[PDB]
Amino acid sequence: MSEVERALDVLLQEAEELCIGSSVVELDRIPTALEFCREFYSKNQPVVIRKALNWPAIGKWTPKYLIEALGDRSVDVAITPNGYADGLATQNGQEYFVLPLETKMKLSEVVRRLDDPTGAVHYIQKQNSNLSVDLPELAADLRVSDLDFAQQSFNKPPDAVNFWLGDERAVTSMHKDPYENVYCVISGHKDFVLIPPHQLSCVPRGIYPTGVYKTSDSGQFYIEPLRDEEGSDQFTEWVSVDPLSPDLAKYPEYARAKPLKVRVHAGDILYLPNYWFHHVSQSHKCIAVNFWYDLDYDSRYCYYRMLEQMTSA
Amino acid sequence: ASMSEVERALDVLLQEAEELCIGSSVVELDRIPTALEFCREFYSKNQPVVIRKALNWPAIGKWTPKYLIEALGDRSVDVAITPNGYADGLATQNGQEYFVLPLETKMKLSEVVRRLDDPTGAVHYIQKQNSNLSVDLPELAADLRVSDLDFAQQSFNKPPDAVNFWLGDERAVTSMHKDPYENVYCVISGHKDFVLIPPHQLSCVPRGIYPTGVYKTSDSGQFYIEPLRDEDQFTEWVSVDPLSPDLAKYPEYARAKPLKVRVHAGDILYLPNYWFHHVSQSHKCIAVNFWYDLDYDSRYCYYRMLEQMTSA
Ligand SMILES: O=C(O)CCC(=O)C(=O)O
Ligand SMILES: O=C(O)CCC(=O)C(=O)O
Ligand SMILES: [Mg+2]
Ligand SMILES: [Mn+2]
Ligand SMILES: [Mn+2]
């Protein structure tokens, strides 16, 4: 074996022997700030806290309640034919990384489309702090100070507060973010598949042309390639494996990955640490809110960049 | 190629750490931080910090040679002796370079102090490590207050694995090395000068494999090196002298960014796990330090991979 493969084997064997990123820790009570810093933040270790929050939103936010309170609020909604916004899809023999069709519609109309199983897949998934921007009133039904146990490790206000409301057909393909993520389910449940960053060499990634979903004048979906002004394709690096049904013949290295599964119910909190890979599915019309905090860099980022170099094409 | 695949990977590591200035300075505080602050800013970042005039222990001031001699009943203490001042350090004999362990003997503290006052004699250091303050000198603990270190100890969440007492000649130098411990270092009298290099700069720090030896005295009291056997024994050790580095022989060291910090009496230095350190001291400097076993995380695994990539 090559020098690089020997090094990656050392990394993976040491992490397995030491149980690094080998489980999602479960707590039945919110930890102290010091506990959270020592056990989860400092160790880049995910944790789920069960029945942590009793926010008024939990039990009150239903599709009906949201229509009554904010039914006329125009919100950004993503639409795909296949349920994979920010996901891989083929057209005319080429695999693209595809961005969703994005549009504005009344929340009332979104809920109506979520209740139509024969139509396209809709998901309010804008991020970009869309709760603060589009649905600020909903803030009164949250108590963000309850998250201080975690926020004290990040020592900064949230970069973003996002509101999520989606079809059970809407699946979030595996990716990673450069944020600390405090994820709070309000209604329904979310199913996460998580892979730690040090298993990068086990996660196949490719470079794909970028496209966006559009509909034709007759209503058929298609993919429009994104291009620069010069006319050259724009490209996105993206995880190539489907963790729900992995093709081990195409991606034998993924047999060495140890993906973790966690379901997050209403009132639970998930800490999803920076740079962890995550794939997400949801119950139908699941509602969630999450808080993103910019990461504080240390040598783990530098090692991860090295690992990207060692696993590059 | 022009560069190995491993060399290209190491160059990316170093470039990214340089742009972010990882481990580029020892943070200086004038007040002890809260436990949460220490965990967030220093422990979780594997980041050294020096806290100035942090401790008011009675030892800082009471501990003179005479006081220690009284308090310990002129006990026989273990002392390390070398001819050159480099216990656990490189030295050459008969054209061969060895990693040399000190001569270890026991003498009354009164005699140690007498020898520390002889510049023409060999270099003496009380530096037993293991846990020689708790195990071999317990009477001294009454002049400290270890709970004052709780701000740090709460991040480690375990008692010290060792508490060491250090009292040395200004000629005694601790060559550059790393430890698999969190270290809380407390100077009692005098000062210590540290040169520190962060773990991710391992590829810049030259290391060799040397035969192991130990200092012994001849018939006439003069020192020589006896090679150590166990059947041929060898030690991996840092090859560079950080005080006057030979950049012609070790050009990679020009990429390291060593940090200098002087730790005075009453100051605390947190030396995080696996940081390289070289240590010099004032004459008859006294220090105590607390070692805590590390709590493994992803960063340790990456470092083990790095050790494999730079095996040298
Ligand atoms: O809820 C989802 O579908 C995606 C959540 C996600 O990717 C995030 O919180 O970063
Ligand atoms: O004080 C010295 O000479 C060395 C201290 C040291 O190496 C340590 O505390 O780990
Ligand atoms: Mg200084
Ligand atoms: Mn995400
Ligand atoms: Mn040491």
Residue numbers in the entry:
A (entry chain A): 1 to 313
B (entry chain B): -1 to 229, 233 to 313
Give passages from the manuscript.
We obtained dmJMJD7 crystals of His6-dmJMJD7.Mn complexed with its co-substrate 2OG or co-product succinate; catalytically inert Mn(II) was used instead of the cofactor Fe(II) to block catalysis under aerobic conditions, as was done for hsJMJD720. The His6-dmJMJD7.Mn structures reveal that the overall fold of dmJMJD7 is very similar to that of hsJMJD7 (root mean square deviation of 1.3 Å for Cα atoms of > 90% residues). Consistent with a higher degree of conservation of JMJD7 residues located on the DSBH core fold (~ 68%) than elsewhere, both hsJMJD7 and dmJMJD7 share almost identical active site features, an observation in accord with our biochemical observations showing their substrates are interchangeable. Like hsJMJD7, dmJMJD7 has an active site metal ion (Mn substituting for Fe) that is octahedrally coordinated by the 2OG oxalyl group, a water molecule, and the highly (but not universally) conserved metal-binding triad of residues (H175, D177, and H278). The 2OG oxoacid coordinates the metal ion with its 2-oxo carbonyl oxygen ligating trans to D177 and one of its C1 carboxylate oxygens ligating trans to H175; the other C1 carboxylate oxygen is positioned to form an H-bond with the sidechain amide of N181. The 2OG C5 carboxylate is positioned to form electrostatic/ H-bond interactions with the side-chains of four dmJMJD7 residues, Lys190 (βIV), Tyr123 (non-DSBH aa), Thr172 (βII), and Tyr183 (βIII). The conservation of 2OG C5 carboxylate binding mode of hsJMJD7 in dmJMD7 is particularly notable since this feature is uniquely characteristic of JMJD7 amongst the structurally characterised 2OG oxygenases. Notably, in the 2OG/succinate/N-oxalylglycine complexes, Trp164 is positioned to form a stacking interaction with the methylene groups of 2OG/succinate/N-oxalylglycine; the C4-methylene substitution in N-oxalyl-D-alanine or N-oxalyl-D-phenylalanine compared to N-oxalylglycine prevents this interaction.
Jumonji domain-containing 7 (JMJD7) is a JmjC (3S)-lysyl-hydroxylase that catalyses the modification of Developmentally Regulated GTP Binding Proteins 1 and 2 (DRG1 and 2); JMJD7 has also been reported to have histone endopeptidase activity. Here we report biophysical and biochemical studies on JMJD7 from Drosophila melanogaster (dmJMJD7). Like hsJMJD7, dmJMJD7 forms a homodimer with each 316-amino-acid monomer possessing an N-terminal helix-loop-helix-fold domain (aa 1–42) that forms part of the dimerization interface, a core distorted double-stranded β-helix (DSBH, aa 160–294) fold comprising of eight parallel β-strands and an α-helical C-terminal domain (aa 296–310) which is also involved in dimerization. Notably, the crystallographic analyses on dmJMJD7 combined with previously reported crystal structures for hsJMJD720 reveal the unusual dimerization mode of JMJD7, which involves interactions between the N- and C-terminal regions of both dmJMJD7 monomers and is likely conserved in all animals making JMJD7.
